[PDB]
């Protein structure tokens, strides 16, 4: 019910075999005398077909657009014309008559702007499908007639239960591309033309591995997305190929404005990824550094590492962020208030108010090569945790949280410091 989804555009396939109430969609019933057989055919003598479409916003979610999003999601070719045809046939037993009736159907697509906890826009696109037919015993024509009131306009699904979601590139967010595959390091400059708006960076990597990706000063906060089904098809060694895929799958990253973060993700050579830099706002020049991490930081794999620079000497602190889904990770790099005596300590309890998680605590040492995570505490159970630890003043630590039970869209982490 929580339905975490890193906000943006999603088109769902809510299923096949939909029909409208009151037989608005019945082709017709025909009745088969025992020992004959009878079919009902859609031959496609004429191609044209009618889809049905309804939207919260015409201005944003226009039929043309919500059609294009199906192209983006499933590469749907035709919307009101099928050359694909269907018929239903039935033989009646020799004892009793049978009678077969046939309804036209629809696949039901949903298009959604899911910004930040709620669907802020929704279209429903009913794509003309290939039939539904009922076979029943011939009814006795003398059977009495019940004065029966018609039903509210709407829909019945006769196809099997289905709901499959597909993220799509927001056509209003531009795409920029890195032609060269990223190797071990790479620094990318946000071009002029993006004009501090949101946009996407398409790229690939050469040899598959774990990468830290941040922006300048770990700000803004980024998301990364795998492109579905990438990297079968065309490839040129060293570079990327377009593949032709705007259907995307969220790997990790926050939607929050002005939270400081860096991503640590696994990346596979036979896939293409989009990054989504948000509105820049700032007029200074920014950059996206891709570094391949061969060190201890792989421990944070497929996490977004959240940054807490700002602890008060003592007191309660909290940090609310979009919660990851069960068995995914959010991480937290925090440095503890006070100068580094190497004997001084501050007492640190790490709670979480709403969802359960397995917390993993590390001390961070940094060398010219990269971070080094020394292992402090494992298996920590966060949800309203009584527990505390003495950590070293001025030292730097990282908490890696695996979500175990997901009870709320946001994960609120507390750092309550005592002395």
């Amino acid at each position: 019910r929580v339905l975490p989804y890193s906000n943006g555009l999603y088109v769902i396939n809510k299923g096949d075999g939909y029909i409208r109430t009151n037989d608005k969609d019945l082709i017709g019933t025909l009745l088969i005398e025992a020992g004959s057989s009878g079919s009902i055919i859609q031959p496609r003598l004429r191609n044209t077909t009618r889809p049905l479409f309804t939207t919260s916003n015409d201005a944003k979610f226009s039929q043309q657009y919500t059609e294009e999003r199906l192209k983006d999601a499933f590469n749907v070719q035709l919307f009101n014309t099928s050359t694909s045809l269907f018929k239903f046939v039935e033989e009646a037993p020799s004892n009793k008559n049978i009678c077969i009736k046939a309804y036209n159907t629809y696949e039901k697509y949903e298009l959604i702007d899911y910004q930040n906890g709620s669907i802020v826009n929704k279209a429903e696109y009913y794509l003309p499908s290939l039939g539904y037919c009922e076979v029943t015993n011939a009814p006795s024509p003398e059977s009495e007639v019940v004065k029966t009131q018609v039903a509210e306009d709407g829909f019945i699904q006769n196809g099997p239960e289905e709901e499959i979601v597909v993220g799509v590139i927001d056509p209003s967010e531009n795409i920029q591309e890195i032609n060269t595959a990223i190797s071990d390091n790479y620094t990318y400059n946000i071009p002029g033309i993006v004009n501090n708006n949101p946009f996407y960076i398409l790229f690939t990597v050469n040899t598959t591995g774990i990468y830290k990706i941040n922006a300048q000063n770990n700000l803004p906060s980024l998301k990364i997305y795998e492109a579905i089904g990438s990297g079968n098809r065309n490839f040129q060694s060293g570079n990327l190929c377009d593949d032709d895929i705007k259907a995307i799958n969220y790997i990790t990253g926050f939607d929050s404005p002005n939270a400081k973060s860096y991503l640590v993700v696994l990346l596979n050579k036979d896939k293409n990824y989009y990054i989504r830099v948000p509105q820049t706002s700032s007029n200074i020049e920014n950059q996206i550094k891709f570094k391949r991490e061969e060190g201890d930081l792989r421990n944070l794999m497929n996490s977004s590492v959240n940054i807490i620079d700002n602890l008060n000497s003592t007191g309660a602190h909290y940090y609310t962020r979009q919660s990851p889904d069960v068995h995914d990770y959010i991480s937290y790099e925090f440095t503890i208030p006070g100068n580094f005596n190497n004997k001084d300590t501050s007492n640190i309890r790490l709670y979480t108010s709403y969802n359960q998680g397995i917390g993993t605590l590390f001390r961070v040492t940094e060398t010219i090569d990269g971070y080094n995570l020394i292992n402090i505490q494992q298996n920590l159970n966060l949800l309203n945790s009584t527990k505390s630890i003495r950590l070293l003043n001025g030292a730097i630590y990282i908490l890696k949280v695996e979500v175990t039970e997901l009870n709320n869209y946001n994960i609120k982490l507390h750092i309550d410091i005592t002395n």
């Binding site: 025909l30 055919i41 044209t48 009736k101 024509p141 007639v145 018609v150």
Partner: protein, 167 residues
Amino acid sequence: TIDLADGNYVVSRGDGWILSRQNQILGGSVISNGSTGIVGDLRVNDNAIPYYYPTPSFNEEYIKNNIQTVFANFTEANQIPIGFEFSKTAPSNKNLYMYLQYTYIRYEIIKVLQHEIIERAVLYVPSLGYVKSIEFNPGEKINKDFYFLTNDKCILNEQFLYKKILE
């Protein structure tokens, strides 16, 4: 005398209606000795024609509009052709005759006053068809009822699906 509030109602009786005198218009095929016959049809804009029986107060337009708002919109739908066919195999001793008849949906729209129906207009819009088989030796007299539908009827069970026409 039907239990409804004074006013105009739109009504669907069944699919599966067939019309007085109209059996055999389309022709029929005769097949013999365990061969198989398959008659069927299509639907340009002949089958497509709906038959209107209007009243004062319920003109053609009124009827059309009012049932297309509630039910199967036909003018739209019967532009795309749809087919149907039947496949009857004969016994081996004797031979048989099968003929095609068009089925219709029966829409009607009704003025009710005093839990009584004072007025009714009717529309038959064509659905698919129906074939009737019969085995015969030559000379064998056949029931006139077989070739002649004397009064409109539904070959399926009727129904009475209704909506009040609004103000």
